[PDB]
């Protein structure tokens, strides 16, 4: 309807109306595609574009939900760093499933964690120790101590 308004008066026949109606339907399709792509640009409004966001994050996860994917993307970015000892203690006590006391000496640069042996298994203890070392500073050394 836009072009026929722009088009001259003597071209007001039915053929022009039909062709311009088809072109206007094509315009609507194109503009809704443009809007969908612009939504895909933003993380919140993207639906199928989150795959490349995950690829940039270098983490591969099976598709579960768009909101879940966005939450995982938000979690992957920053949200790192243990501000104090309490962060590491709280993270480790989840694996140990028991209270843990720390005896840390600045002169020794030594970290020690005491936990009940019966509560936490050997394999999960090794996994928790590897995760701690992944978090624990290179100079510091953490000691896993099972209470007998």
């Amino acid at each position: 309807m836009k072009l026929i308004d722009k088009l001259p008066s003597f071209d007001r026949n039915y053929i022009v109306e039909e062709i311009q109606g088809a072109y206007d339907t094509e315009l609507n399709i194109l503009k809704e595609d443009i809007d969908d792509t612009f939504n895909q640009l933003f993380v919140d409004t993207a639906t199928w574009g989150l795959d490349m966001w995950e690829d940039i994050l270098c983490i591969e996860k099976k598709e579960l939900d768009f909101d879940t994917r966005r939450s995982n993307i938000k979690a992957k970015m920053r949200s790192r760093g243990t501000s104090t000892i309490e962060v590491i203690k709280s993270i480790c006590e989840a694996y140990t499933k028991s209270e843990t006391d720390i005896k840390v000496y600045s002169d020794e640069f030594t970290f020690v964690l005491s936990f009940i042996a019966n509560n936490c298994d050997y394999k999960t203890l090794l996994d928790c120790s590897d995760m701690i070392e992944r978090v624990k500073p290179a100079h510091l050394l953490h000691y896993l101590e099972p209470i007998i």
């Binding site: 760093g81 840390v104 600045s106």
Partner: protein, 346 residues
């Protein structure tokens, strides 16, 4: 590219794309049919050009930056309303309830607590700005006017300048704040990151970190209050728990405060006419307090005697003694002089 893409260029391109029996010329039916769609495509090209600018992190709008920071978590600051205290002058016994609004010029302000004129509680009531902005930070001695007329109230003025009025954080300021946050992260050893948490306490303004004070891994925290005046014990404690909350893994942390140093002085001087011992004493103690504030390093005997003779009312002085000696007094670190004894004899 997009600048090259225009209605005429794509018109010629599409005319070349279509080869057909009928001749192509200006004013042709098919010419107009193609031209309209090519104008549409030029509009689409302009939209696609704007796609680039709106997709970029720079030169974003309010909603674009809002989405980016919601992804990043560095939320924009909306500003704070100005806060101040005004004095109500009028008929005694007049009661002004809470929620009353006072207007100075075109600005609008609201009174928080009830104030009674002539009451024992006083005629001063805190006033908070209705909206955020630095324009609400009214200075001292502003004659506030009631928006709604209240009998018994005549004049309203503020004894203190209004503070707290902060503008809305613009896009660019939050942008460089986010960039600085991304470039620099909290670290254990960099004294800037550690002293940042200590500086978050308003009482202290200078923070010093002393590495290797009790062996390896030992960090000594030195803080300075207002103009290097010791803060209260509760302030030291709360700073201690705060820094411990943000301290790294397994340090030994000790917080110290500036230590006042007593000063005892004694001198024999001849006072000028019309000047007593109390006047020269107060003037010299004020001057020497200023000097103690501005002195760095050891106490200088000659500076002290010069500021003493420069004190008005001093004609001739002799036998100036500071803490039992006339030599320069060495000031240790984190120590400030404090006048305790003044012995002036005429």
């Amino acid at each position: 590219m997009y600048s090259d893409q225009t209605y005429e260029v794509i018109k010629n391109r599409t005319l070349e794309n279509i080869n057909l029996d009928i001749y192509k010329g200006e004013g042709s039916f098919l010419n107009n049919m193609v031209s309209g769609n090519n104008l549409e495509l030029s509009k689409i090209y302009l939209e696609l050009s704007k796609m680039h600018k709106m997709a970029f992190i720079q030169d974003t709008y309010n909603q674009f930056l809002d989405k980016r920071v919601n992804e990043f978590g560095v939320y924009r600051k909306l500003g704070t309303e100005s806060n101040g205290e005004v004095e109500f002058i009028g008929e005694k016994g007049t009661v002004i309830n809470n929620g009353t609004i006072i207007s100075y010029r075109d600005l609008l302000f609201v009174v928080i607590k009830d104030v009674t004129i002539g009451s024992e509680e006083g005629d001063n009531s805190p006033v908070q700005a209705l909206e955020v902005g630095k324009k609400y930070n009214l200075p001292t001695n502003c004659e506030f006017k009631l928006v709604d007329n209240i009998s018994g109230v005549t004049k309203i003025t503020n004894t203190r300048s209004f503070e707290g009025g902060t503008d809305i954080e613009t896009d660019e300021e939050l942008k460089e704040r986010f960039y600085k946050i991304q470039r620099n992260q909290a670290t254990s050893g960099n004294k800037a990151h550690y002293e940042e948490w200590a500086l978050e306490v308003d009482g202290v303004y200078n923070v010093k970190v002393y590495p290797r004070w009790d062996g390896p891994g030992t960090v000594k925290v030195l803080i300075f209050g207002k103009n290097n005046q010791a803060v209260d014990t509760e302030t030291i404690e709360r700073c201690q728990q705060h820094i411990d909350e943000e301290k790294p893994i397994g340090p030994t942390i000790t917080v110290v405060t500036p230590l006042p140093i007593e000063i005892s002085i004694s001198a024999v001087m001849k006072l000028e006419d019309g000047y007593t011992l109390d006047n020269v004493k107060e003037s010299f103690l004020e001057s020497i307090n200023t000097y103690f504030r501005d002195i760095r390093g050891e106490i200088i005997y000659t500076k002290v005697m010069g500021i003493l003779i420069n004190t008005t009312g001093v004609h001739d002085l002799s036998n100036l003694l500071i803490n039992g000696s006339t030599d320069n007094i060495t000031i240790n670190e984190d120590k400030i002089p404090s006048v305790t004894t003044v012995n002036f004899s005429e």
